[PDB]
Structure 1
Amino acid sequence: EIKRFGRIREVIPLPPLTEIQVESYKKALQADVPPEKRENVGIQAAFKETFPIEEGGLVLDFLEYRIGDPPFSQDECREKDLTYQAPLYARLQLIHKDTGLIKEDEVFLGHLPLMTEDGSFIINGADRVIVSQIHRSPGVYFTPDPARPGRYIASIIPLPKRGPWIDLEVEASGVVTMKVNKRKFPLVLLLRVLGYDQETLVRELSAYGDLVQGLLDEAVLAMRPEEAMVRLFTLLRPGDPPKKDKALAYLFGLLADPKRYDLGEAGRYKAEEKLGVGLSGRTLVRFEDGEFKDEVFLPTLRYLFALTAGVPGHEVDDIDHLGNRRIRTVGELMADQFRVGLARLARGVRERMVMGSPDTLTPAKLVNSRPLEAALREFFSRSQLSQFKDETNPLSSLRHKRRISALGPGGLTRERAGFDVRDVHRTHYGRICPVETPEGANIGLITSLAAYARVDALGFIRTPYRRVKNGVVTEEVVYMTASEEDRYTIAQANTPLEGDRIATDRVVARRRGEPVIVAPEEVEFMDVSPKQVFSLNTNLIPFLEHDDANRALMGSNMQTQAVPLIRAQAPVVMTGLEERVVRDSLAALYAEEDGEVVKVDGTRIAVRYEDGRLVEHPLRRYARSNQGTAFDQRPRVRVGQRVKKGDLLADGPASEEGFLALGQNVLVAIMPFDGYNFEDAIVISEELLKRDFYTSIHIERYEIEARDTKLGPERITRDIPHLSEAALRDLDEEGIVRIGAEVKPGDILVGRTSFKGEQEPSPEERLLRSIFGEKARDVKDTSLRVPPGEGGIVVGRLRLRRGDPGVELKPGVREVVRVFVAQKRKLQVGDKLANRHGNKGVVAKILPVEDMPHLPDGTPVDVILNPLGVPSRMNLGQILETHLGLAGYFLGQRYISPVFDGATEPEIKELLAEAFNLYFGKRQGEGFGVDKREKEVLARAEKLGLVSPGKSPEEQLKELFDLGKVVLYDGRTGEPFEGPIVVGQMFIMKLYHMVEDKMHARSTGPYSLITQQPLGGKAQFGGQRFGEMEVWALEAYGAAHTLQEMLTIKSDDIEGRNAAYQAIIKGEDVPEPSVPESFRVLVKELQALALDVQTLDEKDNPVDIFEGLASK
């Protein structure tokens, strides 16, 4: 019972939502591809560039490279805290060119990290994703000259560390110079080296006006290419003597060497596509038969002269235009740092040749795994494009894999981020979400791929459109880049159609991102859907058209922060993407084929498929996510149920029957409430807690090491010296806590003892033990206890002992013990609630069901929301959702209202009317008229003009109900609220609660070593940061002693904090420090620099701030 709105029916589904991660890393590894037929891209092109090297003859070559098999599964890689990787080998043969010797063998080069099915990696047991990067695409560009208002300059740019930037500028003199590596020189000097004469340079280039006359230098056009090459070498490299063998070697490596200059394969397409020529190879110049042969300089000089002349068909390139920016996906980012570790293995080969026995050296002892291993490990563990996977819920992980970052190595920095790149470019339409982006310093830097957006082979983002020929739409879709998009006139997706033919005489369309009304004969493409413009999360916001984009940004971000719930529901009003999100997130479980279910329990689902196979599917139960949220799958099929392929078998976290279930559907009332909902605060009913709504399961891991101390080995044991039998009840035989015990802060989880480091017990300690007849143990309790504010019941245990099979551990560590604790967290005051429209709020008051505002039939609301959080934030979509939820509440139905193609206001009022007949009709059938309190409300609603005068009480109630409003009684008084009050169902999520966001409180704890400032510990929290702006505030108040306590006694003053603690302990007022410790350290650090620092008093006499301590 779920109605779908909308006139637009998408002709194609969303792409494989993780194909930006999966297909990239697959294309780079080419695992299932035979090494004979591999396409010379990615991880093999790194070898075919590094090899073959030769420099006493040596020729190591590249034949095959093969992936190994994972030594460990993904689960035991997460359990062991080891990177999920396979060994990488390669067939390297050594050729002695002077002898003819050949020596083949296969050598270990390094461990290659492998990608999972969903599209992430496991590094040191941690799930980890590699975000895509946006950067400037290579090729040739033409921009207007800043310091010359008349002309434009050209720029040839290749891949980074793959050639230098090249500029072509026309000076005020009129001669055309060329800028390379902070050098300037005329173009003909290089053109002479390229084999051009003045006779050829004129005829094909004469038509652009007087521009050739700025290129002609008769003195340079007179010399041979041989002496022009050396004339070039002297200008840009004026260090060494200009020998002609070095001048040739330089220009060859600079512009002609394919391994030292490789303008991108995408940049070569860009150069070929922009200039209208044809380029074989990725260099600017070749080197055939001994002379240089041009490839790019003549076409790009023609385009520059053409553009400066004003010929049509030539334009300036937009810097942000998404045809001039590209995407570095996972495989490209890895294979780039791969060849870096090969260029460092190259040195590890080159230098190993001058030594040893240069006649016979195996490439086994010529090549080491250390260079490449350390290169890939730096990438997956340190690169800012590789960060902790966000798996708060299935939607979180799907979104994280689709992020596009301008930051990272080779990318931008936040200080030099500026605004140009932070902005929304007109080409983002259909490729980059214009609303989903962080709030804070990373605005516009980190974005999200659009729903229908795909990244092509060259790294450019495309979006589908429907081809239309003569006002008739075709089933043919075409993915076009931003450059190809500017070529056509493209109509909006919501243009009225008479069954696949256009209806209106005025079509809304776009030309280079410009709103233009058009006739059905001028349209050649049409948008596929409104969904293609926004990201996944933004497409999950119903009535998005009625939400201002700023709060809709928050609505997109917070769905990523929603914790999975025990009784998680799909929203009452949906957008139609909720099923596909859980499908592509790989958090649920589906049937591999047609078949029948034969076994169903909480741990496994067994089905017999067509092909006769019997497959049992293990259900992951209460597993810990990176953020501590419970990953839990639950069966959704019965025994004997016959399922089709792709049919749901088990729901993952935050999924209800296969639909994204990020929260709960709660009955909301929009009204103030005694200030408990002041400034975004939220009032909730206790009934939510009774029904376990918004209850989540969170699992935290704890860990303790038993180490080898020079004072003696630490021991995991139940024998803890001075401890009660009660404090050890839940400790098993070997000292670690039992599964199923409830642990509260301070309780022991793993018992441990450490040797004291033999010292005399103090005489007071000796007399103390003599009184109580206790003989001192030689060991102290160092057992792992549960930190404050944390707890739950133990659900997992794990022990890794050195000297036992399968496990190797850190040096000096005898064994490690891990304990897993789970807790059920029900909604409480302080928890953060939110809807998909950007409404935020902290639960401020949990109220008894009796105090809650309720309907005449006794039904109480679940949550009270303040209307004051709406007008200045301009998100009327939450109001439309509440109105639609009111209808579906009494109608007992859910709704699908797509973005920009959802439920109209009249369609909603009709449902509201049909719902009133049910609700009010059932009330008459039970024999109850219109209450006298309701008639009291109906009287005022007429005074202000909310109901029409003259109609009956039932009719006025109906006029309120289709306005979305109802009469509501105050559970505290029985009296009604004086005005009608819009109630309904709203989808509300509970947002994630980071560890540092919980309640902290310190009195006294550890202090740092060098600076004596408060430091967090296992038993105590750290102190709050009292920064300089707070110093100014206390100064502004003139509260000197308050500021003096912060800067001394409460922080780094050793004597002061000890004296103050004792003062409070003995009921004494805390004293002031006679001379603070920061003063003392400053003087001694200055005296260390041989500077006499004199501390003088009122009459200039020396004060000794060291009282008999350092005075001699």
Structure 2
Amino acid sequence: MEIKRFGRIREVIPLPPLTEIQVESYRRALQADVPPEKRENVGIQAAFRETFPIEEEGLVLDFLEYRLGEPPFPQDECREKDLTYQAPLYARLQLIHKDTGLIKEDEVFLGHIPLMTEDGSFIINGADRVIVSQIHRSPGVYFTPDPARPGRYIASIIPLPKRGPWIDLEVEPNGVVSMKVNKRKFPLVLLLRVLGYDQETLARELGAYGELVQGLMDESVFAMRPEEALIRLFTLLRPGDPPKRDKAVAYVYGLIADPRRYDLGEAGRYKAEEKLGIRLSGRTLARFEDGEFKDEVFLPTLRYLFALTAGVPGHEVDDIDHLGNRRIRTVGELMTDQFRVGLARLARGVRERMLMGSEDSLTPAKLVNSRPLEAAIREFFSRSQLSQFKDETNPLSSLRHKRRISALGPGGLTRERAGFDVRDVHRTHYGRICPVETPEGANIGLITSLAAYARVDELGFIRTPYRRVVGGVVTDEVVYMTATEEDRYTIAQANTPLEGNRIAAERVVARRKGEPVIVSPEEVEFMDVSPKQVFSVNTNLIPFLEHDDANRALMGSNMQTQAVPLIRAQAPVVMTGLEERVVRDSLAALYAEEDGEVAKVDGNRIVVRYEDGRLVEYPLRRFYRSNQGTALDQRPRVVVGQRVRKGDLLADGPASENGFLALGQNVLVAIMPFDGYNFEDAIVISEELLKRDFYTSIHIERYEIEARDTKLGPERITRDIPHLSEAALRDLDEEGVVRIGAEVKPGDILVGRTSFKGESEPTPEERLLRSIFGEKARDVKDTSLRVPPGEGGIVVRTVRLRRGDPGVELKPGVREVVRVYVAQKRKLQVGDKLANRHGNKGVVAKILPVEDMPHLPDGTPVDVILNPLGVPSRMNLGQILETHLGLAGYFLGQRYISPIFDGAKEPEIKELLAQAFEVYFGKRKGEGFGVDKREVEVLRRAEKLGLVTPGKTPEEQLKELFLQGKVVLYDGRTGEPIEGPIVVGQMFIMKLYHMVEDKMHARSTGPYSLITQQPLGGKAQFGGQRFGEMEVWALEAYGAAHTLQEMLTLKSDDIEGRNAAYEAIIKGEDVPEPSVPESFRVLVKELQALALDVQTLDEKDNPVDIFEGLASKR
């Protein structure tokens, strides 16, 4: 099956590593491989050099170097033992006695740094996790216009998040400039005097604008000394504190001049110098040297604000949503920030520990307590919003999750504060953030994906590549450049015709500061690398993207993540060219390290004899359960003795076919209504799909149970469960666990556990019951683990971890834990959700036998029937073009690669359809068959609909229909043809993770809440359905008073009513009259706890006791 490639744009550079946003950022933070003496002042190395040295003010604790040891356990062991894949951290510290002059050095153990895997994820407590990158306003100096009053501008100084206060400079109507700090507004003149500025200095610099300087020349404080002006400012900031020079200087220094508390950041410092045209020595608003304050940024900030207000040409306002003003915090920065917080907490503990207790005899090991450092690190990787449970339904799911950009999280935004501006597609998202990929709903515009060619720089600004154009010729020089730098050039489109390297078109479509313009070739300075850089990886996997509406392209890209791996997964007939790169960069498949020969091939492992001679054995991940329950296995794709080159595929990963991403099946699709089973996005499939095991997926469910220490005796995991027969214990082995390979159904025991019964005398009816039968009550009860309803399958793995095992850190009181893995082979059934890459989704509503499906005249039935009514409103025409191209490739036996926006056009598809007709119909002629009578009838209608040209032969008219993607289709039920030609072709359809098997739930009676006594929620807890306010409104509107009262009382929280209702039903009786809900009783008692006398009265205003006399004191 050959692959035909479409497209005319030549990409000079390939896609960058798709996980480099995760991998490279964490490498830069750790710096684990670079020797300590060559480590740069970034990452956790910067954290050590910032908090250290710790001075008592004559004991100094200095930092020299750190090192990271090898992880205690491998990644597979951490997953199996619920451990964190982490590396021990040791810091080599020295304690300096400034009085004596003696230095003692030792290496202290600071804890464990979690390690990133090769694919770019973390294993936290045995679970795979991904740290999502965060987007926020970049630090620096910004100048936005005052909305309340026109003609006025406000200066904003933003440091790194949680690394200083936000500062506002505004020109008050009185003419004096004001500085707002910590919600306290005060005149900047006072602070500006503190930093050593006289009357002539301000006039010499800011006096060339107009009346603005006159409001900055209040001589009431200019004659005042800076020292008392510093104290005077200290009173305004925090009023009431006793004015002391030592305390006042510390507060001001810690507010704007302390690098340990205020940090403008490398990105913030660079933005400040670029905007104000200055050069900062550090990353603080001011420096404190020689016992006095020197200005760093306030004067240039006020100079810019005055010039902006005056109206000089070189000054302009700042768009805060401009992507040059928004930066990305990657995993390395997020971990480093939390590492610094923990290090600061550790330093504070060291400082308070080094000022008391055996001062002469102190060591860095004794002073340093690493628990605050570990607690902050553990908190970040476990309970942070940006630390998310890894989505690994399929390899594309994990790849997307690592490239996600979130505006939420700690230090970011909340939906309430997220308006139409942070949620919108800014013009600078072009080539940096995918415009279409985003979660529809409350998260639209807040969680986004990095563009395919985009990369995050050191400062956190997303750069996109462009080809340099000089003299009208497009060169191979590629420049990665930010949005603010992009605004300075005229950038042409990647589709501009070129004769070699010279631009051929006289009129070139280009962008100038995001606006589309028509320019000459000599005015073009840069060119787009490819159409693919505008979109993310998921969107780049949608063929004929240019023919789909953006709202439906959003759905198609998102649902590719939800596709489950299939046992017979196939790469799509129509591809975009990124299928191989997604598999390669996801690290789910296995490739040869260099050239060599395969020595051993097995389902468990592959051994390759490389040219250098070393034997490398690659264990194969087999039937591994992902975070979503999908089975992730690698199947070998080589044979013994086969010669492989460097990078050649050795074993396909999940949802991959010969190194190509395979998220679904390639099936024959007929676009036509079918008896209402296609109604409103419903999908009709053939039974032939189940016969050959398409859309069949393997899912593994994990069940866990613990044997605990109890005050009544310890729980025992054993096969001897009281009061059960041999049939219930048939599949349990001698240890009480179900045997591996046994088929389990709901209600079957997975593992037997007996718990000692609580000491409680039995009811007299039970006592007589045991007395009659002469059976002594046992001391243990059945607390074994059973299959929940609607679940089951085949037991494939049993994991038993016991207390005292190496590396097994069980919680106290737990003797052992048993984990059982149950695998089920799920076939496609009614209610399962199918989707394609173009946003067309629906559930299977009907499965037909092969003889019922519409079939081709040659006898080939279709596989899937799709409703044509889902096309016109959704405006996603790419599925139609995929169907047309798929039809041609079905008969020509070939697949196609059509890149988005540069690929197969209709003239190219129709000429392929012409060749496909010669095998579709030319084969029929050779076999000795003419034109069907049924085909003649369809052609008679076809010329009446204007689909074929009158006067042509039936063969020519059939060819005309084929070039339109339409064929004569017969009804399998009647044998008669469909009255009009039907678009029949081959389309790639995915099976999504939303399955009716995991979503069906029902409950009659079950667990109830502790306080409200209402049924719990969720299928896992066997809970009831929530009957909310709107559902109550529906019954009120219907007038169903008694139906409403049952749900309020009899079925939710009437303890007496629900017990009596159940007993009445099982006796064949009608349910009794309901009583007061228990939630109302809770409300009354809670209202009484608020010192409110709430009493229910009768017709005569007399109190009525709704507590049955149980709360009345005698």
**Same fold judged by TM-score > 0.5?**
yes
Q: Name the CA distance, whole Å, in 2 between partners of 1:1002 and 1:756.
A: 27
CA offset at residue 125 of structure 1? 0.6
Q: Give deviations 1:859-882, integer Å, cap 9, x for gaps.
A: 000000001111110000000000
Q: Deviation string for 1:217-250 (max 9, x for gaps)?
A: 3444444444443444344444334444444333
Equivalent-residue separation in structure 1 for 2:779 and 2:148 (angstroms): 81
Offset at 1:358?
Answer: 2.3
Distance 1:290 1:1086 in 2: 61
Whether contact under 8 Å (1:555, 1:838) holds in the other structure is yes
Q: CA deviation at 1:127?
A: 0.3
Give me the TM-score of the superposition, normalised by structure 2.
0.97
1:1100 positional shift = 4.3
Pair 1:1017–1:715, CA change in 2 (3 A): farther
Shift in Å, 1:185: 4.3
- Give the structure 1 partner of residue 327 of structure 2: 326
Could you list the per-position Cα deviations for residues 922-959 of structure 1 after superposition, in whole angstroms to 9, with x for gaps in the alignment? Answer: 00111111111110111011112111110010111111
> Residues 774 and 186 (structure 1 numbering): CA distance in 2 closer, same or farther, change over 3 Å?
closer
Query: Deviation digits for residues 256-307 of structure 1, max 9, x if unmatched?
Result: 2222322111111111111222222222322343433333233223322322
In structure 1, distance between residues paired with 2:60 and 2:91: 15
Deviations 1:144-183 (A, max 9, x none): 1223312322222211232222222222233333333334
Tell me by how many angstroms 1:1028 deviates: 1.0
Residue 486 of structure 1 and its aligned partner are, at CA, apart by 0.3
Offset from partner CA, 1:663-697 (integer Å, 9 cap, x none): 00010000101101100000000000001000000
CA distance in 2, matches of 1:256, 1:345: 22
> Kindly tell me: are residues 233 and 768 of structure 1, through their superposed partners in 2, closer, same or farther at Cα, counting changes over 3 Å?
closer
Note the C-alpha offset of 1:995: 9.2
Deviations 1:378-397 (A, max 9, x none): 11110000010000000000
Q: 1:811 to 1:289 in 2, by over 3 A?
A: closer
The 1-side partners of 2:200 and 2:1112 are apart by: 92
Query: Cα 1:246–1:1095, aligned 2, differ >3 Å: closer, same or farther?
Result: closer
Helix, strand or coil at the partner of 1:914:
helix
Note the alpha carbon deviations across 1:947-996, whole angstroms, 9 max, x for none. Answer: 11100101111111111001111000001111110000111000003799
CA contact (8 A) 2:465 2:528 kept: yes
Higher mean Cα deviation, 248-257 or 25-34? 248-257
Query: How many Å separate the matches in 1 of 2:367 and 2:244?
Result: 35
Q: Which stretch has the larger CA shift, 929-938 or 1090-1099?
A: 1090-1099
CA distance in 2, matches of 1:1108, 1:89: 67
Q: Which moved more, 1:410-419 or 1:260-269?
A: 260-269
Residues 706 and 236 of structure 1: CA distance in aligned 2, closer, same or farther (over 3 Å): closer
Offset at residue 201 of structure 1 (A): 3.2
Q: Distance in 2 between matches of 1:251 and 1:1096?
A: 64
Tell me the alpha carbon deviations over residues 96-146 of structure 1, each in whole angstroms, 9 at most, x when there is no partner: 222223222111222211111111101111000100000111111111122
The residue aligned with 1:821 is 822
- Give 1:727 deviation, angstroms: 2.0
Does structure 2 conserve the Cα–Cα contact (< 8 Å) formed by 1:193 and 1:228? yes
Q: 1:1075, CA displacement in angstroms?
A: 4.2
Take 2:692 and 2:1075, find their aligned partners in 1: how far apart are those partners? Answer: 60
Aligned partner of residue 77 in structure 1, secondary structure: helix
CA contact (8 A) 1:1048 1:1078 kept: no
Greater shift in the superposed pair: 1067-1076 or 757-766: 757-766
> Is this contact kept in 2: 1:569–1:665, CA < 8 A?
yes
In structure 2, the CA distance between the partners of 1:1095 and 1:175, relative to structure 1 (3 Å rule), is: closer
CA deviation after TM superposition for structure 1 residue 1106, in Å: 5.2
Q: CA separation in 2, counterparts of 1:677 and 1:335?
A: 54
RMSD: 2.0
Relative to structure 1, the CA distance from residue 620 to residue 59 in structure 2 (aligned partners, 3 Å threshold; closer, same or farther) is: same
Q: What SS does the aligned partner of 2:921 have?
A: helix
* Cα distance in 2, alignment partners of residues 890 and 93 from structure 1: 76
Structure-2 separation of matches of 1:1046 and 1:1078: 13
Cα 1:452–1:712 shift into 2, 3 Å: same
- Spell out, residue by residue over 1:428-476, the C-alpha distance to the aligned partner (whole angstroms, 9 max, x if none): 0000000000011111000000000000000000000000001101110
* Distance in 2 between residues matched to 1:874 and 1:83, nearest whole Å: 48
TM-score by length of 1: 0.97
Taking a change above 3 Å as real, the CA distance of residues 899 and 1059 of structure 1, as seen in their structure-2 partners, is same
Residues 1005 and 1017, structure 1, Cα contact 8 Å, conserved in 2: no
Deviates more, 1:790-799 or 1:291-300: 291-300
The Cα shift of 1:637 comes to 1.3
Distance 1:486 1:1019, change over 3 A: closer
SS in structure 2 at match of 1:293: strand
The DSSP-based 3-state class of the residue aligned with 1:28 is: helix
Q: Secondary structure at the match of 1:1034?
A: helix
- 1:207 is matched with 208
Aligned counterparts of 1:53 and 1:854: Cα–Cα separation in 2? 81
Q: Which moved more, 1:345-354 or 1:534-543?
A: 345-354
Residues 56 and 358, structure 1, Cα contact 8 Å, conserved in 2 = no
Q: CA deviation at 1:1081?
A: 4.4
- Measured in 2, the distance between the counterparts of 1:1102 and 1:171 equals 64
The answer on whether the counterparts of 1:1006 and 1:1017 sit within 8 Å (CA) in structure 2 is: no
- Cα displacement (A) at 1:1110: 6.1
Q: Partners in 1 of 2:165 and 2:1018 — Cα distance?
A: 52
Describe how 1:470-869 pairs up with structure 2 within 5 A.
470-769=471-770, 774-869=775-870
Q: Which moved more, 1:262-271 or 1:800-809?
A: 800-809
Moved more, 214-223 or 423-432: 214-223
CA separation of 1:1091/1:558 partners in 2, compared to 1, >3 Å: closer, same or farther? closer
What percentage of residue pairs aligned between the two structures are identical? 93
- Deviates most, 139-148 or 23-32: 139-148
Q: Secondary structure at the match of 1:758?
A: coil
**Matches of 1:1091 and 1:176 in 2, distance apart?**
53
In 2: Cα distance, 1:672 partner to 1:905 partner: 25
Alpha-carbon spacing, 1:1078–1:626, altered in 2? closer, same or farther (3 Å) = closer
SS at match of 1:1051: helix
CA distance in 1, matches of 2:1091, 2:428: 64
Which 5+ residue runs of structure 2 have no aligned equivalent?
none
Q: Matches of 1:151 and 1:763 in 2, distance apart?
A: 86
Indicate conservation of the 8 Å contact 2:83/2:124, yes or no: yes
| 3-state secondary structure, aligned to 1:36 | helix
- Displacement after TM superposition at 1:1098 (Å): 3.7
Does structure 2 retain, via aligned residues, the 8 Å contact 1:56–1:359? no
Check conservation: 2:545, 2:901, Cα contact below 8 A. Answer: yes
Deviations 1:994-1014 (A, max 9, x none): 799521010111222222112
Give how far 1:331 is off. 1.0
SS in 1 for 2:463: strand
Q: In structure 2, how many angstroms separate the alpha carbons of the residues matched to 1:735 and 1:529?
A: 61
Task: Tell me what 1:370 maps to.
Answer: 371
Provide the C-alpha distance between the structure 1 equivalents of 2:693 and 2:386, rounded to a whole number of angstroms: 39
Equivalent residue pairs, number: 1112
- CA 1016–246 in structure 1, closer or farther in 2 if over 3 Å, else same: closer
- Tell me by how many angstroms 1:420 deviates: 0.9
CA contact (8 A) 2:85 2:123 kept: yes
Cα contact 1:1006–1:1016 (8 A) shared by 2: no
How far apart, in 2, do the equivalents of 1:766 and 1:245 lie?
81
Closer/same/farther in 2, CA of residues 1074 and 381 from structure 1, 3 Å limit = closer
Change (3 A) 1:354 1:249: closer
Most deviating of 808-817 and 692-701: 808-817
Deviations 1:538-571 (A, max 9, x none): 0000000000000100001000000000000000
Answer whether contact 1:889 1:984 (CA < 8 A) is retained.
yes
**Compared with structure 1, are the counterparts of its residues 221 and 1019 closer, same or farther at alpha carbon in structure 2 (3 Å cutoff)?**
closer
| Alpha-carbon distance in 1 for matches of 2:639, 2:901 | 38
Q: State the alpha-carbon separation in 2 of the partners of residues 814 and 230 from structure 1.
A: 64
- Cα deviation, residue 1102, structure 1: 5.1
Per-residue deviation, 1:377: 0.9
Give 1:191 shift.
3.6
- Secondary structure at the aligned position of 2:108 is classed as strand
* Cα distance in 2, alignment partners of residues 307 and 909 from structure 1: 60
Q: C-alpha distance in 1, partners of 2:1018/2:962?
A: 58
Distance 1:144 1:1015, change over 3 A: closer
Distance in 2 between residues matched to 1:313 and 1:41, nearest whole Å: 34
Q: Partners of 1:896 and 1:124 in 2: how far apart?
A: 42
- Secondary structure of the 1:1002 match is coil
Q: Is the 8 A contact 2:832 2:995 kept in 1?
A: no
